[PDB]
Amino acid sequence: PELITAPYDPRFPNRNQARHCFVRFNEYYKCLYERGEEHPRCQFYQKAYQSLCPSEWVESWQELREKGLWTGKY
Amino acid sequence: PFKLPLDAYILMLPITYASAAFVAMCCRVPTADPETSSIAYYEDEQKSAAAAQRYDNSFKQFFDARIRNHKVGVFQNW
Amino acid sequence: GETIDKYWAPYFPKPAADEAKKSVNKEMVGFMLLGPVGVAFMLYDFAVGLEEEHHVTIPPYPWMRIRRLPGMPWGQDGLFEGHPRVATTWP
Amino acid sequence: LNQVWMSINREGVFYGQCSELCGANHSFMPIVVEAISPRQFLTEYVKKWIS
Amino acid sequence: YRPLGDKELWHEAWMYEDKFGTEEDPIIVPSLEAERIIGVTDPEDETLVVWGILKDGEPPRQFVENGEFYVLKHVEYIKKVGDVLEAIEG
Amino acid sequence: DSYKATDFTNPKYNYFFRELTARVQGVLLTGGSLYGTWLVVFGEAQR
Amino acid sequence: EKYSHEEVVYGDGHHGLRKGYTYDFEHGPHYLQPEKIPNFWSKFYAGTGALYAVGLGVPLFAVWWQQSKLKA
Amino acid sequence: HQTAKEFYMEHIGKRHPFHVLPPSPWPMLAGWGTYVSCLGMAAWFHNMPTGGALMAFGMANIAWTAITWWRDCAIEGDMGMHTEVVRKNFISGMWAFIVSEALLFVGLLWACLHLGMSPSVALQMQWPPVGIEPIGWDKRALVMSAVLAASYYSANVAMVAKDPKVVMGALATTIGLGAMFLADQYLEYNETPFTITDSPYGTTFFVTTGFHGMHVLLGSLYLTAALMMYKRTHNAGAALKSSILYWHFVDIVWIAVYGIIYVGQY
Amino acid sequence: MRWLYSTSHKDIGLLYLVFAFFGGLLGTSLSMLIRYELALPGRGLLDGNGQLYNVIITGHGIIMLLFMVMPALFGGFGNWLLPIMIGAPDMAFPRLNNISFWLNPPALALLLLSTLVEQGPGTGWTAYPPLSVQHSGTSVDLAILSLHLNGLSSILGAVNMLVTVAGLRAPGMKLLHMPLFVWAIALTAVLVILAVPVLAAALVMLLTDRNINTAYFCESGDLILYQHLFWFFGHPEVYILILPAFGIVSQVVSFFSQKPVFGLTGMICAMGAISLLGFIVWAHHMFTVGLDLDTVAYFTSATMIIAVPTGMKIFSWMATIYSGRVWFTTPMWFAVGFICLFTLGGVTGVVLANAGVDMLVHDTYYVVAHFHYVLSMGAVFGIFAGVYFWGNLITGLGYHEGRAMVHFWLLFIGVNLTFFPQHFLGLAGMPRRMFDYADCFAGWNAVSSFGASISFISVIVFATTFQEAVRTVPRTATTLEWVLLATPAHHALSQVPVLRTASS
Numbered sequence A: 001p002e003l004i005t006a007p008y009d010p011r012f013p014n015r016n017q018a019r020h021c022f023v024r025f026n027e028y029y030k031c032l033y034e035r036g037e038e039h040p041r042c043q044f045y046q047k048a049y050q051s052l053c054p055s056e057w058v059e060s061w062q063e064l065r066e067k068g069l070w071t072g073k074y
Numbered sequence B: 001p002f003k004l005p006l007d008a009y010i011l012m013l014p015i016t017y018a019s020a021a022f023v024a025m026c027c028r029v030p031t032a033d034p035e036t037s038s039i040a041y042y043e044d045e046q047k048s049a050a051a052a053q054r055y056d057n058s059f060k061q062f063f064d065a066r067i068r069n070h071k072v073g074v075f076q077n078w
Numbered sequence C: 001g002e003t004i005d006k007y008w009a010p011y012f013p014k015p016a017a018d019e020a021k022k023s024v025n026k027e028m029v030g031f032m033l034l035g036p037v038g039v040a041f042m043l044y045d046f047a048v049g050l051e052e053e054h055h056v057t058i059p060p061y062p063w064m065r066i067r068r069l070p071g072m073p074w075g076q077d078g079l080f081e082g083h084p085r086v087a088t089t090w091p
Numbered sequence D: 001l002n003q004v005w006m007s008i009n010r011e012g013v014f015y016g017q018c019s020e021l022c023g024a025n026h027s028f029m030p031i032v033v034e035a036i037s038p039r040q041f042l043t044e045y046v047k048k049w050i051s
Numbered sequence E: 001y002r003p004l005g006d007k008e009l010w011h012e013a014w015m016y017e018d019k020f021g022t023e024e025d026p027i028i029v030p031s032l033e034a035e036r037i038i039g040v041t042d043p044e045d046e047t048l049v050v051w052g053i054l055k056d057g058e059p060p061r062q063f064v065e066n067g068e069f070y071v072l073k074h075v076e077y078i079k080k081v082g083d084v085l086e087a088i089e090g
Numbered sequence F: 001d002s003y004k005a006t007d008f009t010n011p012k013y014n015y016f017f018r019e020l021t022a023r024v025q026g027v028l029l030t031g032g033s034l035y036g037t038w039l040v041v042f043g044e045a046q047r
Numbered sequence G: 001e002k003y004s005h006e007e008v009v010y011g012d013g014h015h016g017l018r019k020g021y022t023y024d025f026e027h028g029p030h031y032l033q034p035e036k037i038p039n040f041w042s043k044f045y046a047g048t049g050a051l052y053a054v055g056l057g058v059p060l061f062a063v064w065w066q067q068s069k070l071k072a
Numbered sequence H: 001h002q003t004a005k006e007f008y009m010e011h012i013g014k015r016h017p018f019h020v021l022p023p024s025p026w027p028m029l030a031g032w033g034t035y036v037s038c039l040g041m042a043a044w045f046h047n048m049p050t051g052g053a054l055m056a057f058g059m060a061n062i063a064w065t066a067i068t069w070w071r072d073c074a075i076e077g078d079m080g081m082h083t084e085v086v087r088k089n090f091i092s093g094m095w096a097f098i099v100s101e102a103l104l105f106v107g108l109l110w111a112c113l114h115l116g117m118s119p120s121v122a123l124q125m126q127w128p129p130v131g132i133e134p135i136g137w138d139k140r141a142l143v144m145s146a147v148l149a150a151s152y153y154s155a156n157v158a159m160v161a162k163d164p165k166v167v168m169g170a171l172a173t174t175i176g177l178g179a180m181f182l183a184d185q186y187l188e189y190n191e192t193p194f195t196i197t198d199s200p201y202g203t204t205f206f207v208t209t210g211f212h213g214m215h216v217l218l219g220s221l222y223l224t225a226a227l228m229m230y231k232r233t234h235n236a237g238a239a240l241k242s243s244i245l246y247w248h249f250v251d252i253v254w255i256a257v258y259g260i261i262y263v264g265q266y
Numbered sequence I: 001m002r003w004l005y006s007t008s009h010k011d012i013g014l015l016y017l018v019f020a021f022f023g024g025l026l027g028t029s030l031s032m033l034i035r036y037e038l039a040l041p042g043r044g045l046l047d048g049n050g051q052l053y054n055v056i057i058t059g060h061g062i063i064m065l066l067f068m069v070m071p072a073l074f075g076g077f078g079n080w081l082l083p084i085m086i087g088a089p090d091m092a093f094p095r096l097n098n099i100s101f102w103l104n105p106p107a108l109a110l111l112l113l114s115t116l117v118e119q120g121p122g123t124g125w126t127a128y129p130p131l132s133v134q135h136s137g138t139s140v141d142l143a144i145l146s147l148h149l150n151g152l153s154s155i156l157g158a159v160n161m162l163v164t165v166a167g168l169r170a171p172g173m174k175l176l177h178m179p180l181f182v183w184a185i186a187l188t189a190v191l192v193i194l195a196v197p198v199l200a201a202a203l204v205m206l207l208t209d210r211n212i213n214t215a216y217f218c219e220s221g222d223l224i225l226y227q228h229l230f231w232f233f234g235h236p237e238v239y240i241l242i243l244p245a246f247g248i249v250s251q252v253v254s255f256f257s258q259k260p261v262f263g264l265t266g267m268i269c270a271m272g273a274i275s276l277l278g279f280i281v282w283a284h285h286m287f288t289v290g291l292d293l294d295t296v297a298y299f300t301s302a303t304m305i306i307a308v309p310t311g312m313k314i315f316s317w318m319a320t321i322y323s324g325r326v327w328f329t330t331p332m333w334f335a336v337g338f339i340c341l342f343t344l345g346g347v348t349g350v351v352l353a354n355a356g357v358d359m360l361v362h363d364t365y366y367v368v369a370h371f372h373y374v375l376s377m378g379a380v381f382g383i384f385a386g387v388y389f390w391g392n393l394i395t396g397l398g399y400h401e402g403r404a405m406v407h408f409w410l411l412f413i414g415v416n417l418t419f420f421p422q423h424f425l426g427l428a429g430m431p432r433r434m435f436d437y438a439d440c441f442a443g444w445n446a447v448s449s450f451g452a453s454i455s456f457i458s459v460i461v462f463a464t465t466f467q468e469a470v471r472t473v474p475r476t477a478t479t480l481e482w483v484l485l486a487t488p489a490h491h492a493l494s495q496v497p498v499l500r501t502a503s504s
């Protein structure tokens, strides 16, 4: 058995890792819009943001997406 | 006000060092990775990874050989 | 006529009439460089003031219209705020 | 979201408290970390969280 | 007197005198009262300052070692030298 | 011969500015301080 | 008179003991003469005792006040 | 009283060029007025009844004591109590006060620079936030820049002029150009498409510009009080020079405020 | 009337000293509750009320930092001593000097009144958000307004001091002949002017967050920005409180050693270097907040450079006592005790300056022991050294020498046996700002609570030292306040003294 977590992103070097959470959460929905729903890269992005973001942050982000208050293009 | 004593220049060397370090630290922050007011900065993954790795390497690459050698103390405690 | 300022007056000499007028002209050149044009545009701006209108309602983003406490110390809306622009319906 | 990289050398039970003033009950937020071997962790403990 | 250039005109000179006070020829310090505090430096060290009190009708007095002697004189007006005698410029 | 009635620093205005205010303001601040102390201590905030 | 600019500028030319002082603090040789206040050591000890009592009893009153509010 | 001036000449005036004051009651009243206005401000924050009235009562008491104190200072300046060294002490004190106010503005603009450069995830890392329309630099703020630079040059005219009519006209021109800065700032505050509760952009913009505008108002009142003393005797002394220095300080502060907020979008 | 309407610097300095004694009594009283609650594990006299304990430590820290040490050193000794020392007949702005005092009893009244309102301001003396924002009611606003008024007091006093030094000096006396007390007070005034308005700006931001629903330190703001602004103020603040203590120690050591100060220009350059480096190392209070490693790296490397000028000052004090003719009285012991026990507090600061070591001892009682060494041995000893030294000049009363040595020894025993075990508690991991601890921490807390009672008894005995004074006639001195009578006249320096350079 081996446990898989979010890899180290070179783009996010600081100790505060909120931006890594946000960018992975947004890359998931960008992958979902562009390359279908069942592409392996989209699952990689989904497991990547689920591994980093607190659950309260994510559920606040889907309620902002459902209310229409998400500033992303997609 | 008076003649600067031979001490005061030996004081002024690390004081000048600390002031130059402070100025360089304040100057390099607007040339760092998280100081971008856009989400479209991170959609170019090659440039952003290069910039953030350059922000990692500087002032840390002087210490890599002694981090690998565990030179974490003045003495040698095993 | 025996004031302190007059008593100590000869011991504090003034540092040395047409040079004053030359300095006034030199500073008034820079005054008239930016003086009349700013006053003219500000008097134009006072007459093109509260006549235009904006109908851009803003969605109630979490960073918009912070209400950590109920209302304001003076009332409900902001001070100097005739027309709130953030959507209070949202839809 | 402040990240810490940590690697533990030995098994045991490690204690802690909260170290930033946060109210009337600041004294009463303790921390306990239980450390076990990786094969136990990957064969017994993580089976408690499979749905 | 010493050169009065770079001196404030209200400083009451006598402190700008060209005379070293000796026992037989002291420096006369003017005073509006019967006693007055003055300050003398050490002749071998400028950073050392000694403050003393001169009294009227007393023998000449030295404050620091190998320093000047001083006698107080009670006067009604003290010459505010810088406009009192260099305006006279005699 | 150097003071008018329009002048703010008239010597005839010194009693009103310096003597009357020194006691009127002295009792007004006592009254304001006692009320402010009672208001902050024994009052309920509605916001 | 009594409200002129000179009264504002140079003060009031009072001389001698002021009202209840036993020594001239304004023009005498000492601005504080604590050996001339009658019964000085009684007043000094009473004032120091009052200062000690207040400075040590204000936080105790604030503890008693906050705990009487909960116990209600 | 008649011998009080004689006593002052004999004991203080003829010995040194410095001014010694009689006892005064205004600092104690000003301190307790600050106490009353602080209690009123605390009550007015949390919407207690009769709290804003108490705060205005305390501020009115502070302003009245300050005006009485400054009238005493002007009275003492007109009986010739202040020599040239005392006036230079006034200029040095104004320089120290100006340095304190400049550090206050540096602390205020520190927050603007910090918040504007790195937008958080709470703002969805976009600066300025979506919905906020920033105030441009190619519009009425540029007119304010030109007007306030003209006020700088007109205050510079009054410092070097020797004709009383030119000095009074230059002072009135600078005061009038300052009052045109404030009435135009009021229009910016009314036409703007954001409030103080709309994002850290709105917070930083309104707090910084409000402090700068309050300093414009105080400098204009100081220059006005300096003009009326020059109107009577054709001599102002330290009141004119300190006020011109303070006005120049306000003009220098506006340069940083404009360049950071209006140009830098921070 | 005299004490209400005064324009004399000598009456205002005495009023500052009496006010600072009152604030010291209040903070002594608030500190016996801290040590009486912490004596035993469990719940003590506070009945398990943690909000009341937080209120007590917040009020006690603010009072002892701002209404005891600064009104004693900067306002009390500086205002009484500066114009006499430089030969000025009065201050530059005598009525500004009275409002610099009279804004302090309103601030103290607001701070003491915030404790009786709602549940009080339990936030710590640093008042970090969002804990300060979350407090509902009026108490926190009264506390912050009290800090605003005290900061205005400090800025006005610093302006008056800086203009009094630069423009009312005695004729012939340059910036070479002023004593080190004057140089310390001038550098303290410069620090106050450069540092206090940043705190004022941060506190205005805190009020706008609390009451105007703005976005400075909030959900959409940045909470690290408050710590940046507050500690940019606060690290100059601790050097504001210790430089007049250095000046008093220099004047006391030079007096009873019958010698001038060793290395005067080195002393002045060291005080200037301490004043300059205090403005670029503020973020050593923020090692655990998540800053980048380069920033932490700089703030580690720049903090330890402060050791060199302080060591130069201590070694120059030892050289001043060296080769002298020393007579040990009560002020001389308080200076020797200062130099011995400030060194102990300074060396723990070097340990704390190293960031990796600071990850283990941050917000523990190790920090508490450090700053009670540099403040109860550094500033309190400096204050008490000046009380016995200049006391017959300032107050007109002498002191009994035996009871003063009893007071010194009771104090020295009490404060050493109070804060030395707190090093062992902080090394073991006992955290700050807690009223209940683990069972194993009981012994050193019992020892420290025993020591605090000795410190309190020492405070009691100090009121018995005063007695009647003996007055003699002066002839000569090395500073101007010792050629004056005790007490001086209302207009000290009836004639302005001049400094005459020796001729050829």
Ligand code: HEA
Pocket (backbone or CB within 6 Å): I017, I020, I021, I024, I025, I027, I028, I031, I034, I035, I057, I058, I060, I061, I062, I064, I065, I068, I069, I072, I123, I124, I125, I126, I368, I372, I375, I376, I379, I380, I383, I387, I411, I415, I418, I432, I433, I434, I435, I452, I455, I459
């Ligand atoms: C000047 C600073 C100062 C002084 C003197 C003291 C004095 C004392 N302090 Fe404290 N203390 C602080 C500054 C100070 N303290 C600060 C800043 C905090 C932080 C609060 C917070 O975290 O929010 C703190 C908190 C603090 C704690 C930590 C509480 C906690 O973390 O929960 C403890 C623990 O024992 C303590 C105890 C004591 C004791 C027993 C004394 C004894 O020394 C008792 C005092 C005895 C004295 C002798 C000093 C009084 C001086 C005079 C009376 C001189 C005045 C006289 C004249 C002017 C003539 N105080």
Ligand code: HEA
Pocket (backbone or CB within 6 Å): I238, I239, I241, I242, I284, I285, I303, I304, I306, I307, I308, I310, I311, I312, I314, I342, I343, I345, I346, I347, I348, I349, I350, I352, I353, I354, I358, I361, I362, I363, I367, I370, I371, I374, I375, I378, I379
């Ligand atoms: C009197 C006030 C005072 C003074 C003078 C100092 C002086 C110093 N302080 Fe401190 N400090 C405080 C008051 C003070 N401090 C307070 C109140 C806090 C807590 C704030 C809070 O409430 O949170 C604090 C906390 C504090 C921290 C934050 C740590 C933390 O809380 O987690 C740090 C970190 O660097 C620090 C370090 C230093 C250093 C390096 C000095 C140096 O200036 C000391 C230098 C002196 C010496 C080093 C000794 C003399 C030198 C020699 C004899 C030469 C030989 C030495 C060597 C060769 C190294 N102290």
Ligand SMILES: [Cu+2]
Pocket (backbone or CB within 6 Å): I234, I235, I238, I284, I285
């Ligand atoms: Cu520090």
Ligand SMILES: [Mg+2]
Pocket (backbone or CB within 6 Å): D019, D020, I288, I363
């Ligand atoms: Mg902490």
